[PDB]
Design an enzyme around this catalytic site. Structure first.
Site, PDB file in Angstrom:
ATOM      1  N   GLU A 278     -23.626  47.163 -11.602  1.00  0.00           N
ATOM      2  CA  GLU A 278     -23.314  45.663 -11.870  1.00  0.00           C
ATOM      3  C   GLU A 278     -22.224  45.553 -12.746  1.00  0.00           C
ATOM      4  O   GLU A 278     -21.384  44.603 -12.505  1.00  0.00           O
ATOM      5  CB  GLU A 278     -24.638  45.279 -12.820  1.00  0.00           C
ATOM      6  CG  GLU A 278     -25.818  45.565 -12.131  1.00  0.00           C
ATOM      7  CD  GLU A 278     -26.081  44.628 -10.717  1.00  0.00           C
ATOM      8  OE1 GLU A 278     -27.105  45.039 -10.179  1.00  0.00           O
ATOM      9  OE2 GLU A 278     -25.305  43.741 -10.411  1.00  0.00           O
TER      10      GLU A 278
ATOM     11  N   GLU B  98     -23.147  44.872  -1.211  1.00  0.00           N
ATOM     12  CA  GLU B  98     -24.272  43.581  -1.489  1.00  0.00           C
ATOM     13  C   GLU B  98     -25.019  43.413  -0.580  1.00  0.00           C
ATOM     14  O   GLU B  98     -26.147  43.133  -0.634  1.00  0.00           O
ATOM     15  CB  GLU B  98     -23.575  42.502  -2.250  1.00  0.00           C
ATOM     16  CG  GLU B  98     -23.069  42.555  -3.499  1.00  0.00           C
ATOM     17  CD  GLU B  98     -22.009  41.707  -3.958  1.00  0.00           C
ATOM     18  OE1 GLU B  98     -21.425  41.058  -3.077  1.00  0.00           O
ATOM     19  OE2 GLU B  98     -22.022  41.562  -5.174  1.00  0.00           O
TER      20      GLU B  98
ATOM     21  N   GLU C 246     -27.526  37.316  -5.133  1.00  0.00           N
ATOM     22  CA  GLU C 246     -26.658  38.185  -4.371  1.00  0.00           C
ATOM     23  C   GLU C 246     -26.390  37.404  -3.080  1.00  0.00           C
ATOM     24  O   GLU C 246     -25.569  37.581  -2.487  1.00  0.00           O
ATOM     25  CB  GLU C 246     -27.798  39.377  -3.802  1.00  0.00           C
ATOM     26  CG  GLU C 246     -26.871  40.712  -3.850  1.00  0.00           C
ATOM     27  CD  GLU C 246     -26.390  41.137  -4.987  1.00  0.00           C
ATOM     28  OE1 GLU C 246     -27.019  41.456  -6.040  1.00  0.00           O
ATOM     29  OE2 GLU C 246     -25.185  41.338  -5.271  1.00  0.00           O
TER      30      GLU C 246
ATOM     31  N   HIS D   9     -26.340  40.318 -14.524  1.00  0.00           N
ATOM     32  CA  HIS D   9     -27.071  41.735 -14.117  1.00  0.00           C
ATOM     33  C   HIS D   9     -26.935  42.847 -14.908  1.00  0.00           C
ATOM     34  O   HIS D   9     -28.021  43.554 -15.186  1.00  0.00           O
ATOM     35  CB  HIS D   9     -26.557  42.074 -12.723  1.00  0.00           C
ATOM     36  CG  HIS D   9     -26.517  40.992 -11.704  1.00  0.00           C
ATOM     37  ND1 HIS D   9     -25.935  40.981 -10.378  1.00  0.00           N
ATOM     38  CD2 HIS D   9     -27.544  39.793 -11.595  1.00  0.00           C
ATOM     39  CE1 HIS D   9     -26.270  39.735  -9.802  1.00  0.00           C
ATOM     40  NE2 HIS D   9     -27.322  39.367 -10.455  1.00  0.00           N
TER      41      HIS D   9
ATOM     42  N   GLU E   8     -22.453  39.098 -12.170  1.00  0.00           N
ATOM     43  CA  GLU E   8     -22.477  40.697 -12.556  1.00  0.00           C
ATOM     44  C   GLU E   8     -22.507  40.991 -13.908  1.00  0.00           C
ATOM     45  O   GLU E   8     -23.223  41.778 -14.455  1.00  0.00           O
ATOM     46  CB  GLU E   8     -21.250  41.251 -11.783  1.00  0.00           C
ATOM     47  CG  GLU E   8     -21.212  40.800 -10.411  1.00  0.00           C
ATOM     48  CD  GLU E   8     -22.120  41.205  -9.290  1.00  0.00           C
ATOM     49  OE1 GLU E   8     -23.196  41.825  -9.736  1.00  0.00           O
ATOM     50  OE2 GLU E   8     -22.116  40.930  -8.369  1.00  0.00           O
TER      51      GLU E   8
ATOM     52  N   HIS F 295     -23.304  35.999  -3.548  1.00  0.00           N
ATOM     53  CA  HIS F 295     -22.154  36.808  -3.495  1.00  0.00           C
ATOM     54  C   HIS F 295     -21.798  37.268  -2.054  1.00  0.00           C
ATOM     55  O   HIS F 295     -20.482  37.166  -1.708  1.00  0.00           O
ATOM     56  CB  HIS F 295     -22.762  38.069  -4.070  1.00  0.00           C
ATOM     57  CG  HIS F 295     -22.920  37.970  -5.477  1.00  0.00           C
ATOM     58  ND1 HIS F 295     -23.418  38.904  -6.413  1.00  0.00           N
ATOM     59  CD2 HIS F 295     -23.057  36.793  -6.433  1.00  0.00           C
ATOM     60  CE1 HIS F 295     -23.537  38.608  -7.725  1.00  0.00           C
ATOM     61  NE2 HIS F 295     -23.268  37.307  -7.546  1.00  0.00           N
TER      62      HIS F 295
END
Ligand SMILES: [Fe+3]
Ligand SMILES: [Fe+3]
Lengths: 167, 392, 131, 515, 392, 74, 130
Positions: free
Chosen positions: D103, D198, D232, D136, D133, D235
């Site tokens: 991350e 990802e 995610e 995360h 991130e 992302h």
């Protein structure tokens, strides 16, 4: 062989004593270029301080940089390399060298040798990163052309390895 | 039913919970429960912000402060490290030393900005219902605020994009978090400026909230010529991430950004009957003082007084300051030409009023930054240099 | 149904039979699948969406949707696309529920995930390449 | 005028400002990326989520309050911290902290995409990913931070950011989801980090693990991990827009297949055996065979929904897939041999497979009992768990010709005389240095890009040193200073100390010396 | 150890959880899971605000809308019911009908005010650091803002205390929530006013944040003589809880309160360089428009248009409005004498500027309330009545 | 003045406003209770918690998020 | 000590023995007790306060403190008073922790509960009377 401890060993203490005796910008520049030409990159001359050269290079960098701020004028910190060359001219010179390389093997050594000679603090940071980025761009486009074209056997010969074992 | 297996939770299933209870020893296997107890605390006790942030970056011993060893597993073509000391001219004995005084990890950062998010929309629904926009000066609203406060969002947008390389290049966790939070606050300012223009457009028929005129002013109007050139240099001209953060937040935004936001649009809003803009400038100024707290700790506390590279860093910070302060002076000299287009108000828009505004911006800057890195500066000389661009 | 099950195809076999098809010659390259996979994080709001939207109007429109229980989340696989309307979910929950509040518990999304107004859609269509 | 105005209650919704974001960027000569790339095609794309700063903070803070409420109030009152099966509580030391660096490196990788992006929406979109991130990273940190406070073994949960540097498994982790992203082409992160990282591997790594966590009594990790993956989908939406622009430009498409297969093998070389080992060997209760989890999430779903769909647009199936599938079946068992043999180098307490575990391994992997099973059972008979035995399986491996080598590229361990997965030892001498490579895909990367892979391995650093001296130097001990954090069993008594390791007399050799 | 028994949780203990699992039927015993499904939804679907609020009060059938039966179990001495129809002149076919358009039960109420609480402190910590107070007009800051804006907190405080009987006497849940939320926002305004005065005292030496001068002004200064008499009547003179809410929020605070807060202190703050006060007035005005939304639905939707007592209620609302409007007009007539003490600013403090301000307050009030209950009002006549107290 | 001022980062804590709450009430003839009571003694007392409107909302909302997080999610 | 236990005194007896003392003549009027009872809602912050504050520095100053586990909350009973310092709790947790943030999980308080600065204290003292 038997390695000494990682973060505090006789090789590093020994190399810190050499560094402390550097008293000028030109001397530290000679000391740092010779060091990177001899102990860094796959084309280094020796692996005798392999697990220590990276920490030693940091300590060499720290000496050259302090000697720059104490001795060099402000303009030389921005526009010139510690070798005396114009930092902009160094960028144009090494760019035209890697674009003139006829193979990925000629181009990789031009980029590797450039980082050995002009990695900061000799060349200014902003000019170096811009130059390294342009050199890496040309090195990627020529390496990623037919990346699987050469078989492994032929790729080993072109690299020049000594094949010691193939299971 | 389902094709797969409905997995039984070990917390609640009687059979699995009994097995887990039988395997879990009736005693702790260590009494040290402080998460990363070995972190050097900056304050009286180790903070949760530090436990979650510090030493997250896997730096090796050849990056000052790294607790790891060895070379990186994969590097750029040519041999550039994943992280390296070549990324900045500055030096330190420990890059991990930086501590945001606000102690913002991610959750408290979004928690505070969510409060501002939802409360803004409740303010606007009530402000529109209040009809308070009726008392604003129409010329200030249409010819100065919409056109030039809208153009100022591009300065904020450029500062945000300057952090793109900083977010990749910087060498420690707390620095990386500081830069990114500072970057979002900058794009927030750009969006909050456009949000106010869209909001005013809903209340004033004919009020065009399009960005064409603000962009044309930001890119071609000589009032923003110096500011645009400075931001294009901080954003795209350099890659020293320390230089980017310093020139951005501690020189340009601390002098030009503070003057435009606080001394011009926010201040003059409260002499032209503008009851709406002070709600938005209150957020951008709050973001500045919070960002300044973090930027000050990086460059003053850690770097300018590093036990080994303090004077080494101040050498670069002085060269940086000298260059970008001249840019900000040239940017402020262009910006004070906007006073020739505003309604004359004594003590605010006259020569004495702009003089006292420049004395506030440069005087505060000497106290907040210049005096902390040993950069001598004549405030009266800088005020007179900008006042050269002011039309009486 | 069937083809969108988590334990479909080779996933039914075990032991030697599973390896024989896993190591089969025709199964050494990826096979194009017109399916989508959406994972929903279990919550009070999501369990209401699962029972009354995807399994009611979502399955009536797309009979191929499969919903599998995976302890902490819902494993949803369907052909073509999977749609969830936040405005519809808000009326079901009786609370403010925008499309951003919907994404609070929408985790994995194997497919082209996007939002159109108040509707979340993960589709098998390659936008910018198809159409 | 000053009297009449529309007093209708209005605000400004997020998509109202977001439609003007694209106009925020202005043209100038230096407005290009700073990082090296080979993809110079047009990428003026729109992001599929109208996210602005204020709205980004609103969704994430809303997620956190529910998560932190569940942890700080709910599960704490239940005492759920110490309800995890010991095997799984140890496995969350590795998984959460190793993901933390994945991350954390994603922060920087997303910043390169942010920097290399040209459209203002994609710059704003990747900034939001950059922020995620960071969230995360602090979330993975919070799991271990919480585990440290309420789990019966805080050691390993409390000091992983330094005690991970001792072991070899952490070496490969710094490439799979770290150096593999940030050290290379910037816009290529839309392939390695997003299209493969990802889109493919986060689903088993972050989501599928939550089912194993719950199965072994861990409701802490699902509370946090499932909330991680809710970001995610935004992302991969950013990465997909770029891959489209790369596929449409023929000058840029000639590099996509190569980078895709390189990125896939780079990430699968570590992810496939390491997590397969952590799932099956680091748990008491199994959700399903790891090879099935891999087949469902990697080969079938991601391979078909992403790569198979993109196949009609030049994107080819990764030529390393057949070798990857062989790794899905055996490689994690090969890694178990290495991870159990070198257990003093880790920071978690391992547990040998019991008689129920062995039956599950042999049933789902026919032949496991005759190979891996007989080895594990022999080690147990030799005293693998007994601190008074002086037995460490690494010495046992070398005594029988089962040498462990470290791949110069992937850092993944390899035991050619015992490995059933994809791998063959290649030892090359180049400029006085010896290098060991394990597969055709990593070897080609080292032959072409040697300056990119000069990563020292654990044997080159610890050569000639005794085992307990490395552990003590790297702080692999508990608060008493002598008891090891790592253990060969998950019980609360007979814990190994530095003296117990020292009596074994394990000294690190040079595996490449014999060549 | 411990003296009592360590109770085993049925959710996790394997033995008890197994017993509980055996006792729980494998099927639901009813499919109706909508909490209080029988509540008549005001909007397209039933909202959580209605489910948690509606029918919480146990009203019997002889209180309009009550679902219970029988007399109260215990009543006052003499026989006054716990809740009864004697508590208000107004009548309705169902007291449960009221719906806050903001749909505030307790949790969204404190969630929105927590955001304002925490963000205020971040604003003040940054505003003090910004030093923006330097540009404020000193006379406005010390002689007008401190003395009379501080005196206005007593008007806000008095309105808050008017709700004390309303919170006890009103006859339905959603109304009670509306009144209490309106009461806290009023005491909030009183505290936020004192909060700003304390803050200025930290930035301006000599600035006295004591309430002595504001209290003496509220009680003896003729500028607040009309307002003080009105609030003492709405608070303590009457007990009809509907009259209190109407006279409080829909007449006095909607005319005098809006003029003093928004047309005087908030507006003139943006002509005297005051960059701080608009932050506080932004909250009180937001509270007003949120409170107005609930008061509007109570008196207009439910009462003034009740299908059976619509005209019956409007009869009292007219009598109430006519009385308290005269009070507010007399309160505004006193308040415009404060313009004789402020610095003269064209279009704001001159006779034309105050006239347009009074036309905004009365014109909006006619649209928001008078036109909804059939209350005729000559706006020009009310402006001239207030301007009689204005000094030229 | 317009140039020099104390720029130290300060706010105003809840108990700072709470110390002035007692002064918010003013004396007038009708300032009495409306409900019947037998207790007419002096009750000018202090409350043991320095609670103001903003701080009340802050702590209670903090309680709710943990509670509703446990229920809706956990 | 023993008298402050939840199952102290008559609470130990069961069956007829419990009833005989419960309906005893001397136990039909309240008996003055100089004790206090504080109930702490279980949470991450409170479990840290219980283990490291009241059972550490709180029991050293007040040895009569008793802390019993009651599944969902902590039952604390002591003589004289019970003190919990929010600043001390904040130092232990490493996050902002005011006296109002302490009250998030401070439930029942049998006694005169009040706050003095940043310290919460429930005392047996009749303030305004003693
Ligand atoms: Fe992530
Ligand atoms: Fe990600």
């Amino acid at each position: 062989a038997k390695r000494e401890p990682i973060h505090d060993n006789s090789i590093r203490t020994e190399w810190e004593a050499k560094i402390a005796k550097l008293t000028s910008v030109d001397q530290a520049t000679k000391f740092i270029q010779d060091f990177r030409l001899a102990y860094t990159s796959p084309f280094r001359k020796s692996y005798d301080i392999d697990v220590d050269y990276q920490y030693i290079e940091r300590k060499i960098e720290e000496k050259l940089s302090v000697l720059k701020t104490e001795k060099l004028p402000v303009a030389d910190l921005i526009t010139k390399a510690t070798t005396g060359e114009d930092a902009a001219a160094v960028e144009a010179t090494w760019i035209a060298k890697i674009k003139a390389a006829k193979s990925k093997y000629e181009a990789e050594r031009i980029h590797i040798e450039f980082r050995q000679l002009y990695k900061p603090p000799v060349l200014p940071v902003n000019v170096f990163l811009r130059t390294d980025a342009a050199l890496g761009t040309v090195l990627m486009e020529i390496r990623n052309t037919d990346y699987y074209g050469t078989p492994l056997e032929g790729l080993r010969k072109e690299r020049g390895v000594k094949v010691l074992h193939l299971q | 039913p389902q094709s797969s297996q409905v997995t039984k939770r070990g917390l609640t299933d009687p059979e699995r919970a009994a097995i887990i209870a039988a395997a879990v020893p009736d005693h702790a296997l260590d009494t040290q429960r402080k998460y990363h107890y070995f972190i050097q605390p900056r304050w009286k006790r180790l903070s949760e912000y530090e436990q979650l942030s510090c030493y997250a970056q896997p730096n090796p011993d050849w990056i000052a402060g790294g607790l790891d060893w060895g070379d990186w597993t994969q590097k750029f073509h040519g041999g550039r490290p994943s992280w390296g000391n070549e990324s900045t001219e500055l030096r330190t004995t420990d890059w991990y030393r930086h501590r945001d005084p606000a102690r913002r990890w991610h959750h408290p950062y979004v928690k505070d900005k969510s409060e501002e998010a939802r409360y803004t929309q409740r303010f606007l629904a009530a402000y529109s219902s209040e009809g308070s926009i009726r008392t604003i000066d129409p010329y200030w609203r249409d010819e100065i605020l919409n056109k030039y406060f809208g153009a100022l969002l591009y300065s904020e947008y450029g500062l945000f994009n300057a952090h793109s390389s900083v977010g990749r290049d910087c060498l420690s966790d707390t620095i990386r978090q500081t830069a990114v939070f500072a970057a979002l606050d900058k794009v927030d300012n750009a969006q909050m400026i456009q949000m106010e223009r869209l909001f005013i457009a809903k209340l004033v028929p004919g009020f065009d909230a399009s960005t064409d005129v603000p962009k044309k002013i930001w890119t071609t109007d000589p009032i923003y010529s110096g500011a645009r050139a400075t931001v294009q240099e901080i954003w795209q001209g350099v890659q020293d991430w320390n230089e980017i953060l310093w020139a951005g937040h501690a020189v340009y935004d601390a002098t030009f950004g503070q003057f435009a936001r606080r001394e011009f649009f926010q201040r003059l809003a409260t002499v032209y009957g503008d009851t709406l803009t002070p709600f938005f400038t209150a957020q951008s100024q709050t973001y500045f003082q919070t960002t300044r707290g973090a930027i000050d700790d990086l460059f003053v506390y850690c770097l300018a007084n590093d036990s080994e590279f303090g004077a080494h860093n101040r050498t670069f910070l002085n060269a940086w300051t000298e260059h970008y302060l001249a840019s900000s002076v040239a940017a402020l000299k262009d910006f004070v030409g906007l006073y020739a287009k505003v309604e004359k108000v004594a003590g605010a828009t006259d020569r004495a009023g702009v003089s006292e505004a420049l004395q506030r911006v440069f005087g505060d800057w000497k106290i907040d930054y210049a005096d902390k890195i040993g950069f001598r500066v004549d405030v009266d000389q800088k005020v007179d240099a900008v006042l050269a661009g002011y039309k009486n | 149904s069937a083809h969108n099950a988590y334990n479909a195809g080779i996933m039914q076999k075990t032991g030697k039979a599973f390896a024989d098809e896993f190591f089969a010659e025709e199964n050494q390259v990826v096979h194009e699948s017109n399916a989508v996979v959406l994972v929903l994080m279990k919550s009070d709001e999501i369990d209401a969406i699962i029972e009354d939207i995807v399994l009611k109007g979502g399955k009536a429109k797309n009979p191929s949707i499969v919903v599998e229980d995976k302890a902490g989340f819902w494993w949803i696989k369907a052909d073509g696309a999977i749609e969830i309307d936040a405005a519809e979910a808000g009326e079901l929950l009786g609370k403010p529920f925008s499309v951003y509040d919907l994404l609070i518990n929408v985790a994995s999304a194997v497919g082209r995930a996007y939002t159109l107004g108040t509707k979340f859609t993960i589709t098998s269509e390659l936008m910018g390449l198809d159409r | 005028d000053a009297l009449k105005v529309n007093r209708a209650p209005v605000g400004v919704e997020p998509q109202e400002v977001h439609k003007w974001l694209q106009s925020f960027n202005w043209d100038f000569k230096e407005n290009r990326t700073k990082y090296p790339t080979k993809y110079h095609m047009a990428n003026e794309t729109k992001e599929q989520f109208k996210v602005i700063a204020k709205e980004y903070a609103r969704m994430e803070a809303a997620k956190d309050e529910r998560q932190f409420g569940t942890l700080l109030d709910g599960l704490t009152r239940l005492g759920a911290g110490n309800k995890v099966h010991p095997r799984w509580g140890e496995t969350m030391k590795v998984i959460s902290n190793f993901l933390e660096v994945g991350e954390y490196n994603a922060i920087a990788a997303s910043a390169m995409l942010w920097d290399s992006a040209t459209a203002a929406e994609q710059k704003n979109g990747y900034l939001a990913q950059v922020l995620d991130e960071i969230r995360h990273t602090h979330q993975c940190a919070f799991i271990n931070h919480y585990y440290s406070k309420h789990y019966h073994d805080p050691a390993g949960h409390n000091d992983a950011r330094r005690t991970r540097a001792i072991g070899p498994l952490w070496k490969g982790m710094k490439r799979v989801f770290a150096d593999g992203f940030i050290s290379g082409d910037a816009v290529e992160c839309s392939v390695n980090l997003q299209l493969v990282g990802e889109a493919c591997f986060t689903n088993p790594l972050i989501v599928a693990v939550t089912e194993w966590a719950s199965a072994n009594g861990d409701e802490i990790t699902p509370t946090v991990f499932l909330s991680v993956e809710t970001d995610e989908l935004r992302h991969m939406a950013n990465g997909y827009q770029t891959v489209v622009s790369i596929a449409n430009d023929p000058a840029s498409a000639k590099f996509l297949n190569t980078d895709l297969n390189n990125a896939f093998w780079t990430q699968q070389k570590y992810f496939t055996p390491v997590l397969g080992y952590l799932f099956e060997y680091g748990s008491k209760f199994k959700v399903e065979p790891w090879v099935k989890t891999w087949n469902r999430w990697v080969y079938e779903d991601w391979g078909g929904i992403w790569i198979g769909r993109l196949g009609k647009y030049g994107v080819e199936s990764p030529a390393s897939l057949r070798d990857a599938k062989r790794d899905a079946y055996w490689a994690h068992h090969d890694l178990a041999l290495a991870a159990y043999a070198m257990w003093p180098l880790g920071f978690a307490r391992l547990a040998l497979p019991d008689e129920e575990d062995q039956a599950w391994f042999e049933a789902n992997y026919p032949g496991w009992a005759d190979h891996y099973g007989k080895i594990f059972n022999e080690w147990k008979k030799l005293g693998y768990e007994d601190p008074k035995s002086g037995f460490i399986p690494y010495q046992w491996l070398l005594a029988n010709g089962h040498d462990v080598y470290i791949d110069r590229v992937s850092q993944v361990p390899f035991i050619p005389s015992l490995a059933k997965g994809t791998g063959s030892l290649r030892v090359h001498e180049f400029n006085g240095k010896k290098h060991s490579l394990t597969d055709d895909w990593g070897e080609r990367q080292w032959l072409i890009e040697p300056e990119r892979y000069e990563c020292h391995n654990v044997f080159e650093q610890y050569e000639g040193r005794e085992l307990s001296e490395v552990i003590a130097e790297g702080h692999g001990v508990r608060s008493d200073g002598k008891t090891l954090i790592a253990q060969p069993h998950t019980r609360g008594d007979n814990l190994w100390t530095l003296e117990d390791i020292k009596r074994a007399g394990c000294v690190f050799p040079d595996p490449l010396a014999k060549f």
